[PDB]
Amino acid sequence: PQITLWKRPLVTIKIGGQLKEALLDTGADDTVIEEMSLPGRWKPIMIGGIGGFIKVRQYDQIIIEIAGHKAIGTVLVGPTPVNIIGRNLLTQIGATLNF
Amino acid sequence: PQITLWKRPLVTIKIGGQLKEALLDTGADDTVIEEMSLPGRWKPIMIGGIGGFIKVRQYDQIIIEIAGHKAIGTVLVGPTPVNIIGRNLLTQIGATLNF
Numbered sequence: 001p002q003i004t005l006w007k008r009p010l011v012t013i014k015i016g017g018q019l020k021e022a023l024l025d026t027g028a029d030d031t032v033i034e035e036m037s038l039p040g041r042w043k044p045i046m047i048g049g050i051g052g053f054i055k056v057r058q059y060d061q062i063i064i065e066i067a068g069h070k071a072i073g074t075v076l077v078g079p080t081p082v083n084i085i086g087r088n089l090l091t092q093i094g095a096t097l098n099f
Numbered sequence: 100p101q102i103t104l105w106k107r108p109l110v111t112i113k114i115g116g117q118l119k120e121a122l123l124d125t126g127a128d129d130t131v132i133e134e135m136s137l138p139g140r141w142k143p144i145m146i147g148g149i150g151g152f153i154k155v156r157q158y159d160q161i162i163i164e165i166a167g168h169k170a171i172g173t174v175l176v177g178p179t180p181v182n183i184i185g186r187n188l189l190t191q192i193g194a195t196l197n198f
């Protein structure tokens with residue numbers, strides 16, 4: 001659908017069979033989800049944001065549903081302020097910015 | 100215009116008489132610009148995200164042109180790693196997320 005930005009663009013996602021709320025973030029290269037138990041193999045990496053760097057678990061080829069749309073790709077799991085859906089998955093659901 | 104998300108959604112902006120490149124960020128509530136000697140009154144505040152918080156100067160009623168689109172609002176100035184256009188200004192230029 002078309003989403004305006006007067007409020008945070010929050011949507012419901014399904015990951016690991018569990019429902020969560022996440023923010024569609026065009027300023028995020030990657031997708032970062034709060035700590036959780038997620039089925040799959042992972043590797044430790046570090047990512048950066050506005051305030052600095054944090055340690056996260058990188059999971060590849062993870063099936064995730066975003067607002068009813070299917071995506072399968074890399075999901076980083078760690079101590080993020082909020083769940084964010086980044087460009088790696090926004091492109092998969094065909095999201096674009098328009099004005 | 101329509102901006103795909105294959106790469107970072109960077110656009111040219113004009114602020115304080117200077118042209119800069121900025122990232123259209125739907126995951127940012129506010130607008131944060133790289134350290135610049137903007138004239139006028141300001142208030143010190145703290146903003147955060149991945150990695151923690153940073154100290155910025157809050158300026159009200161700052162004129163800013165985003166990809167040819169004029170806007171006026173609150174602009175934060177500080178040691179941000181990237182110039183970020185947040186929702187406070189994205190709404191003014193009528194930007195939406197579409198999928």
Ligand SMILES: CCCC[C@H](NC(=O)[C@H](C)NC(=O)[C@H](CCC(=O)O)NC(=O)[C@H](Cc1ccccc1)NC[C@H](CC(C)C)NC(=O)[C@@H](NC(=O)[C@@H](N)CCCNC(N)=[NH2+])C(C)C)C(N)=O
Binds near residue numbers: 131146181
């Ligand atoms: C005016 C009052 C402000 C009050 C103040 N508000 C805030 O701090 C609000 C919540 N912060 C935000 O909205 C901030 C942006 C700053 C801002 O707008 O203020 N948003 C953010 O920080 C969001 C995530 C988030 C969202 C909501 C809450 C918390 C965090 N991240 C935005 C960020 C943009 C990037 C260009 C710096 N992206 C990222 O951090 C992603 N990282 C990346 O994409 C990295 N690969 C980038 C390269 C690494 N660095 C480098 N090369 N130098 C990450 C999510 C995988 C407060 N609450 O204290």
